[PDB]
Design a protein around this ligand. Structure first.
Ligand code: AV8
Ligand code: AV8
Ligand code: MG
Ligand code: MG
Lengths: 172, 177
């Protein structure tokens, strides 16, 4: 396979559904790559660098339709749909919320933040507040997903989502 | 030591801080208790029952001052302080948020929920809404703590980010009164 971060991270996402977060590491992934294993380290210094890219790709795949939208008229709806999409996506992956927890944007992901914030800026949120809104909504969703897992949940999720969104509206 | 679940679960919290959540299980707790280990199985049907009790004890210790408040007139302040206290507490234990994720009240902990909800009922929340408010605030705090644990990053940082969402969430809840 081509030696690129995304190709390796997408192979690791396959390994995640197969073996869980426990079965995902640089060594463990290099083992699933054969002669190409050692190339993994040129792009990821540690497990967390790999998990950051996996986490970003996992949610990019599901949020792409919302990311492509131009001149979003209703930031409330748009943010709510982001959260619902994140929740559905994390629930769809084995250890999805565990993989996401602690992740941060990659360099290429961070370059996409200005576009991500534009619907909120057009709504009246400052650039600084718009980013805090994004981080907060993702963390509320992450907390719901990781807790609702147990070896009503929908109602409780939207109850808190709508309250959060109403409180943000009061800030404008 | 005395053969009670609370003594067993508090020993398991020592194991959590020592070895992390991977070092916590019925078998490993039995090893820690030595000759008294087999007694734990009369009190916990499965690992999750142990984790449920640990998760309650962990936070009860820190929430006790807030739980003792009577005629709480400022439910906003009270709930905000509960969230801040949970956040501080979960961050103070090794794998604290991971231990907590997925836990549910025990029988004896559930008996305390009516008292937990009093400030919220007195503010005008129904019994169902008040419980949902508790769940929501704790899940928000859980998501923050679990995501905080990990160089310059975008945004204002964990404290300001946590408070931003807490205050927004509390304002939205106040809006349905
Ligand atoms: C310190 C720091 C800085 C920045 C972060 C950013 C930009 C995101 C995330 C972060 O966690 C961050 C973070 O922790 C997420 O997790 C997202 O998944 C998310 O929350 C949402 C959303 N709420 O719509 C998205 O649009 C996604 N694109 C992800 C953007
Ligand atoms: C499905 C269901 C039902 C009920 C739950 C309850 C009552 C709590 C918790 C739950 O998770 C629940 C849950 O999941 C917690 O986790 C708490 O730690 C919490 O959130 C707060 C708080 N917000 O003040 C507390 O005061 C604590 N005492 C814990 C009470
Ligand atoms: Mg994130
Ligand atoms: Mg809980």
């Amino acid at each position: 396979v081509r030696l690129s971060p995304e190709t390796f991270a997408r192979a690791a996402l396959k390994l995640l559904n197969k073996s869980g977060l426990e079965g995902v590491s640089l060594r463990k992934l290099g083992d699933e790559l054969g002669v190409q294993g050692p190339a993994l380290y040129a792009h990821f210094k540690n497990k967390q660098e790999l998990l950051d890219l996996m986490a970003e790709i996992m949610l990019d795949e599901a949020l792409a339709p919302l990311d492509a939208m131009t001149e979003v008229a209703d930031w409330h709806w748009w943010l709510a749909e982001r959260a619902r999409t994140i929740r559905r996506t994390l629930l769809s992956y084995r250890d999805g919320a565990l993989l996401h927890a602690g992740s941060r944007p990659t360099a290429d992901g961070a370059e996409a933040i200005p576009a991500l914030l534009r619907p909120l800026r057009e709504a009246g949120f400052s650039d600084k507040e718009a980013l805090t809104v994004i981080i907060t909504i993702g963390r509320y969703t992450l907390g719901c997903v990781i807790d609702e897992q147990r070896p009503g949940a929908d109602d409780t999720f939207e109850f808190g989502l709508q309250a959060l969104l109403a409180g943000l509206r009061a800030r404008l």
